[PDB]
C-alpha cells in the first residue's frame, strides 16, 4: 500500500524524475516483487485525473520505458477502459507512449511469460480499435486519423506478425472477438471521412486477415521453365 | 513473325526458351517459327560474305510496321544479332544502319506498349552491342532517339550518353 | 589440453574481479566458441539505470573499442537526459587513448553515468 503514497510523495516534490529511480529502488527491497512497479501508477495517477492528461508525471513513464517490465505496462494499458471514458485527450498521450513503445520492437522476458506478453499485444490492438469509437458519433477528424496512423505504424510487417500469429495459435476466443470488432470497425468505416483516411484501414485489415494464413505464402511467379521433374517421373 | 503475336499469343510467350535452338533435342518445344529462325541462321551460317548487305534495306522498310510487342523485337534481334563481326570486319558502312534499326525497333516498342516486361535483357543486350561493336561512332544519332523514351527506360539506359 | 568453455581465461579471470555494482551476462551465443565476447551489463548503484552496452571484443591483443550500440538510435532518441548521457559517453570514449575493453569500457561508462547528474 505504501507504494501509492510513495509515488505521491515522489510527485509531491519536483524531483528530476530520473534520480527518482534511486528513491524507488531505495523504498523497495530491490527485487522482492516488481509486480507492484510503475505498472499500476499510470492507472491510479490517471484515475482522479479524468478529463486531464496529467502532465509532468508522464515523464516518469518516459524514463521508465527505457528498461522496465514492458509486459505489465502493456497488459494494464490494454485492459484500461479509457476510450469508454471518452476523454479524447489522455488517449492521445496513450498513442504517443505506445509510439515509443511498439514502433521499434518489444523486449525479452527470459521466460515463457514473454509469450503472455504477446497475448497482451493482442488485447492492445483491441484497445486501438476503440479509437474509432472517438468517431462513432460523427454528428459534427484529427483523432481518428492519428489513431489509424499510429495503428498502421504499430502494424509494421516482420515485427509483430509472428507475435500476432502466436497469440492467435495460443487462444481463440479473444482472437474471434478481435476479428468481430475488426469487421464492425470496417463496417463503421463506410463513411467518406477523408481521402487519406479509410484507405490504410483496409490495408491493416488485410494484414490481420493474412496473419493466420502464413508469413511466406506461395505467391511467386514468372517461373518460365518447362518442369522436367514431373515429366521424367 | 506475325501470326497473331500482338493481342495475346499464349502463355508460351516466353521468348528465350522458344527462340533458342537445340530445344529440338527433345520431342517438344519445337514450334515451327523457331525452326524458321535456325533456317535463317542456316544460310547466314555460310552466306556470310556479301549477302548481309541485303538485310539493312530488308530491315529499314520491312521490319518497321510489323512489330508492336517486345518478343517480336527479341526475335528480329536474334535474326540479325549474331553477325555484327562480319560488318565490323568488312561491311563497316552497314553496321550503323543495323544499329539505327535496333534503336528504331526500340522506339517502336516503346511507343506501343503498356509496360516493358523484360527490361534488363534488352538493356545488357544493347550494352554488349555498344561496348563490343559500335565503339563510339553512332553515339550522337541514337541520342536523337534516346531522349524521347520512357522515364524508366531513360534511367535504365542513362549511361549510353557516354 | 583445451579451453572447451571460452576464450583464454585471462579476460574472464580479470572481469570476475570487478565490483558487484556491475552485472555482466551474455546474449544469444552468436560467437560461442571463438569470439565468446558480447557482454550485457546492468549498472546497479545509487544512480539512474540505463540501456546495457554491446561490448564485442577481438582477440586478446585488445585493439578493440568493443561497444557498438546495436540499439543506439531508438533507445537513445527516447529522452533528453539519457541522450546527454550518451553524448558524454561517446565524448569520453573518444578521449580514451587505446581503450581496453577489459576495464576501461565499463569504468568509463560508469563515470559517464555518474556525470549525468550535471
Residue with cell 507512449: A97
Q: How far apart are CA A95 and CA A93, in angstroms?
A: 5
Q: Which long-range contacts (CB under 8 A, 24 or more apart) does B148-157 make?
A: B148/B107, B149/B106, B149/B107, B149/B110, B150/B110, B150/B116, B152/B116, B152/B119, B153/B110, B153/B116, B153/B119, B156/B119, B156/B123, B157/B123, B157/B126
Distance (Å) of CA B16 to CA B19, B115, B125, C81, C101? 5, 19, 13, 62, 58
**3-state SS, residue A84:** helix
Chains touching chain B at 3 or more Cβ pairs under 8 angstroms? Answer: A
Which chain B residue lies closest to A228 (C-alpha atoms)?
B26
Residues of A in contact with B11 (CB under 8 A): none
Q: Give residue for cell 526500340.
A: B106
Q: Between chains, do A22 and C46 touch, taking CB under 8 Å as contact? A: yes
CA distance A69 to A146: 27
CA quadruple B79, B85, B91, B92: dihedral positive or negative?
positive
Report whether C6 contacts C29 (CB < 8 A): no
Q: 3-state SS of chain C?
A: CCCCCCCCCHHHHHHCCCCCCCCEEECCCCCCCCCCCCEEECCCCCCCCCCCCCCCCCCCCCCCCCCCCCCHHHHHCCCHHHHHHHHHHHHHHHHCCCCCCCCHHHHHHHHHHHHCCC
Q: How far is CA A205 from the centre of its chain?
A: 16
Could you give phi then psi for residue A175, rounded to 5 degrees?
-65, -40
Inter-residue contact B12 to B1 (CB < 8 Å): no
Q: Which of B13, B14, B29 to mutate to test the interface with A (most CBs of A within 10 A)?
A: B14
Which residue of chain B is at minimal alpha-carbon distance from A223? B14
Cβ of A99 under 8 Å from any chain C Cβ?
Answer: no
Residue A222: in which H helix or E strand, if any?
none
Cβ atoms within 10 Å, residue A117: 23
Rounded (to 5) percent helix, strand, coil in chain B: 65, 0, 35
Distance CA C24, CA C7 (A): 16
In angstroms, the CA B116 to CA B109 distance is 9
Return the closest-CA partner of residue A231 out of B28, B21, B23: B28
Q: What grid cell was written down for A84?
A: 469508454
Best to test chain B binding among A221, A222, A226 (most B CBs inside 10 Å): A226
Q: Is A65 on the interface with C (CB under 8 A)?
A: yes
Which of helix, strand or coil describes residue A198? coil
Give chain C's length: 118
Residues of B in Cβ contact (< 8 Å) with A226: 17, 28-29
Residue A161 grid coordinates: 506478425
CA dihedral C100, C101, C103, C104 (to 10 degrees): 60
In A35-54, the residues whose Cβ lies within 8 Å of chain C are none
Whether B109 and B66 have beta carbons less than 8 Å apart is answered as: no
Contacts of B19 in chain A (CB under 8 A): none
Search chain A and give the residue with CA nearest B11.
Answer: A224
Task: Please tell me if residue A67 touches chain C, with a CB cutoff of 8 Å.
Answer: yes
Among C79, C86, C116, the residue to mutate for chain A (most A Cβ within 10 A): C79
Instruction: Judge whether C7 and C61 are in contact, CB under 8 Å.
Output: no
> Burial letters for C26-56: b for 16+ Cβ neighbours within 10 Å, e otherwise?
eeeeeeeeeebbbbebebeeebbbbbbbbbb
CB A152 within 8 A of CB A144: no
Is A228 in CB contact (< 8 Å) with chain B? no
This structure's resolution (Å) is: 4.8
Residue B19 and residue B34 in contact, taking contact as beta carbons nearer than 8 Å = yes
- The subunits that touch chain C, with at least 3 C-beta pairs less than 8 Å apart, are A
Question: B13: which residues sit within 8 A by CB, 6+ positions away?
Answer: B71
Could you give the CA distance from residue A207 to residue A155 in angstroms, rounded to a whole number?
8
Identify which of A113, A202, A204, A109 has the alpha carbon closest to the alpha carbon of residue A150.
Answer: A204
SS3 track for B41-102: HHHHCCCCCCHHHHHHHHHHCCCHHHCCCCHHHHHHHHHHCCCHHHHHHCCHHHHHHHHHHH
SS3 B109: helix
**Residues before each break in chain C (C–N > 2.5 Å)?**
none
| Distance between CA atoms of residues A13 and A112, nearest Å | 39
Q: Give B160's DSSP letter.
A: G
Cβ distance of A224 and B16 shorter than 8 Å: yes
Report the distance separating Cα B74 and Cα B79, nearest Å: 9
Q: Which of B17, B28, B29 sits opposite A224 (nearest CB)?
A: B17
Is the CB of residue A212 less than 8 Å from the CB of residue B4?
no
Q: Assess B53–A contact: CB distance below 8 Å, yes or no.
A: no
- The set of residues, in sequence order, having a beta carbon less than 8 Å from that of B112 and lying 6+ positions away, is B68, B69
A18 to chain C, any CB pair closer than 8 A? The answer is: yes
Q: What is the rounded distance in angstroms from the CA atom of residue B161 to the CA atom of residue B146?
A: 9
Distance CA B101, CA B98 (A): 5
DSSP state for residue B116 in the 8-state scheme: -
Q: Which of A185, A93, A110 has the alpha carbon at shortest distance from A148?
A: A185
Structure-block grid coordinates of residue A189: 468505416
Other Cβ atoms closer than 10 A to A122: 21
Grid cell locating C50: 540505463
CA distance A21 to chain C (A): 6
Nearest Cα to Cα of residue A141 among A184, A191, A194:
A194
Cα–Cα distance for residue pair C24/C38, rounded to 1 Å: 10
CA separation for the pair A125, A117 (Å, rounded): 13
Alpha-carbon torsion (C108, C111, C116, C118), positive or negative: negative
Cα C30 to Cα A214, B95, C38, C44, C56, distances in angstroms: 28, 59, 9, 27, 11
**Is the CA virtual torsion B139, B141, B147, B151 positive or negative?**
negative
Alpha-carbon gap, residue A124 to A129, rounded angstroms: 9
Amino acid at each position: 500500500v505504501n507504494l501509492k503514497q510513495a509515488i505521491l510523495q515522489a510527485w509531491k516534490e519536483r524531483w528530476s524524475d530520473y534520480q527518482w529511480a534511486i528513491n524507488m529502488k531505495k523504498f523497495f527491497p530491490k527485487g522482492a516483487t516488481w509486480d507492484i512497479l510503475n505498472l499500476a501508477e499510470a492507472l491510479l495517477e490517471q484515475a482522479m485525473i479524468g478529463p486531464s492528461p496529467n502532465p509532468l508525471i508522464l515523464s516518469y513513464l518516459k524514463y521508465a520505458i527505457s528498461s522496465q517490465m514492458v509486459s505489465c505496462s502493456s497488459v494494464l494499458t490494454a485492459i484500461s477502459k479509457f476510450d469508454d471514458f471518452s476523454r479524447d485527450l489522455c488517449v492521445q498521450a496513450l498513442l504517443d507512449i505506445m509510439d515509443m513503445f511498439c514502433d521499434r520492437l518489444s523486449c525479452h522476458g527470459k521466460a515463457e511469460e514473454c509469450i503472455g506478453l504477446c497475448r497482451a499485444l493482442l488485447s492492445a490492438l483491441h484497445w486501438l480499435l476503440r479509437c474509432t469509437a472517438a468517431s462513432a458519433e460523427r454528428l459534427q477528424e484529427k483523432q481518428l486519423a492519428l489513431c489509424l496512423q499510429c495503428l498502421e505504424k504499430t502494424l509494421s510487417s516482420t515485427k509483430n506478425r509472428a507475435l500476432l500469429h502466436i497469440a492467435k495459435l495460443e487462444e481463440a476466443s479473444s482472437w474471434t472477438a478481435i476479428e468481430h470488432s475488426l469487421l464492425k470497425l470496417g463496417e463503421i468505416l463506410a463513411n467518406l471521412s477523408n481521402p487519406q483516411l479509410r484507405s490504410q484501414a483496409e490495408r491493416c485489415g488485410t494484414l490481420i486477415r493474412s496473419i493466420p494464413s502464413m508469413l511466406s505464402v506461395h505467391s511467386e511467379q514468372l517461373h518460365k521453365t518447362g518442369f522436367p521433374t514431373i515429366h521424367a517421373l | 513473325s506475325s501470326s497473331s503475336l500482338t493481342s495475346e499469343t499464349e502463355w508460351v510467350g516466353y521468348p528465350f526458351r522458344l527462340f533458342d535452338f537445340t530445344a529440338c533435342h527433345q520431342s517438344y518445344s519445337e514450334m515451327s517459327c523457331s525452326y524458321t529462325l535456325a533456317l535463317a541462321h542456316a544460310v547466314w551460317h555460310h552466306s556470310s560474305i556479301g549477302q548481309l548487305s541485303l538485310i539493312p534495306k530488308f530491315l529499314t522498310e520491312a521490319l518497321l510496321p510489323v512489330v508492336k510487342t517486345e518478343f517480336q523485337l527479341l526475335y528480329v534481334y536474334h535474326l540479325v544479332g549474331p553477325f555484327l563481326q562480319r560488318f565490323q570486319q568488312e561491311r563497316t558502312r552497314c553496321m550503323i544502319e543495323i544499329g539505327v534499326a535496333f534503336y528504331d525497333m526500340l522506339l517502336n516498342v516503346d511507343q506501343c506498349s503498356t509496360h516493358l516486361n523484360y527490361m534488363d535483357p534488352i538493356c545488357d543486350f544493347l550494352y554488349h552491342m555498344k561496348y563490343m561493336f559500335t565503339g563510339d561512332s553512332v553515339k550522337e544519332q541514337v541520342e536523337k532517339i534516346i531522349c524521347n523514351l520512357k522515364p524508366a527506360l531513360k534511367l535504365r539506359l542513362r549511361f549510353i550518353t557516354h | 589440453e583445451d579451453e572447451r568453455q571460452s576464450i583464454p581465461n585471462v579476460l574472464q579471470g580479470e572481469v570476475a574481479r570487478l565490483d558487484p555494482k556491475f552485472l555482466v551476462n551474455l546474449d544469444p551465443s552468436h560467437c560461442s566458441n571463438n569470439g565468446t565476447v558480447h557482454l550485457i551489463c546492468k549498472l546497479d548503484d545509487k544512480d539512474l539505470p540505463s540501456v546495457p552496452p554491446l561490448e564485442l571484443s577481438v582477440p586478446a591483443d585488445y585493439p578493440a573499442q568493443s561497444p557498438m550500440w546495436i540499439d543506439r538510435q531508438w533507445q537513445y532518441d527516447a529522452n533528453p537526459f539519457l541522450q546527454s548521457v550518451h553524448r558524454c559517453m561517446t565524448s569520453r570514449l573518444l578521449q580514451l587513448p587505446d581503450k581496453h575493453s577489459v576495464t576501461a569500457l565499463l569504468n568509463t561508462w560508469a563515470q559517464s553515468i555518474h556525470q549525468a547528474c550535471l
